[model samples]
Target: RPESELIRQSWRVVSRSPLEHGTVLFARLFALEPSLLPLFQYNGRQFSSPEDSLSSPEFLDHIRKVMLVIDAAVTNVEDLSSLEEYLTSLGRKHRAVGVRLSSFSTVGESLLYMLEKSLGPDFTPATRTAWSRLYGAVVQAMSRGWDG
Candidate 1:
């Protein structure tokens, strides 16, 4: 499906501060799932908040990768198979690590929250629909796991 103009343009704005929004996305995700933290394992000083842990150089790199994946999907939203491959590849990898399908929902929620906060006035109903559609597509593919 073609990304609507609102979706593409809003994402363009969001992509501008990839680090800023990316950190916020992870911060929200870790808040929702503290267990996911040890999965990333940064051997830094004890931290008081999810944001603090997400600030680690390693964690920041991880966040960047996550955003890059979204960027790739947005870039090729028109090519559904590419999106399918990207999502299913990550999903199968998650399956290997025992990551639950619920994890994908959590990530989607966190991403939406970050976009809503960062996009501010630029975030429109169409933008929400576009992103929600994008997330739905990813999760739908991810749900088709290698578990069988």
Candidate 2:
């Protein structure tokens, strides 16, 4: 369960640390559900993952720029064209690797585990369900980009 301010800030962090976040995502995802790994293997990695961006400082900073962009978008999300573009790019990559739409749940599930451990009582069932629904909407849209 995240507060409004925290949600705003986390969107920034997520956009900023997509590569790092996605890297850890894949790491945890593969561990929890090894079956999902095969779909993303290309020279030993997933393409849209944090590993897809960089292991170096320079590229990490690039992800930071994306965060800044997202921060602006969140503050003024009147139009979602740019944001849709972002998802499309990611969707394309996932489609390229043949990753199933359902498998995207694995990452958020892993993060939820972290929240349950860290937030304990604060992480109510509603809070977890909200995130699950949100993640599912994202996966559903992204899955469309892959279908064609």
Candidate 3:
């Protein structure tokens, strides 16, 4: 069976609870790389603490935005070409905001962490592998922005 099918199937569950699941993703993200926290400046000020991020309406909106991007990836799992320009622009935006490409590795791990926590036993080896491949494709497209 194609791995894209596995991706579509697994995403259905998490998409049902995007904000909740995305919160776990970002929570784990800051826990892994607290330094990344300051990149999310709002009103020209940094979050004083990781937990402080959770309370911001803008931050919560960001979580929803991230989940929607992942949903787009899942929607185009079989062929990411459709999302290439969008993701490329997204990458440029992140770069403009001072995010490094290396940090995406941490984000990937956080994504998997969220999936594992959300899926539990359903996050089988195959499922994890599929997600890794999918996220890698998305990052590859996004990385174009860093290419000068």
All candidates: CA RMSD (Å): 2.7, 6.0, 0.9
Question: Sort by TM-score, best first: what order?
Answer: 3, 1, 2
TM-score of 1: 0.84
List TM-score per model, in order.
0.84, 0.55, 0.97
| lDDT score, candidate 3 | 0.94
Model 2: ten consecutive residues of lowest lDDT: 1-10
- lDDT tens digits, residue span 93-132, model 2: 7777776766767756865564454456766776566445
Clashes of each: 0, 1, 0
lDDT of 1: 0.78
lDDT per residue, candidate 3, 1-148, as tens digits? 4799989988998999999999999999999999999999899989989999999999999999999999999999988999999999999999999999999989999999999888899999999999999999999999998975
Model 1 residue runs over 4 Å out of place are 1-3, 42-49, 146-148
Best by lDDT: 3
lDDT of 2 at 3: 38
Ranking by lDDT: 3, 1, 2
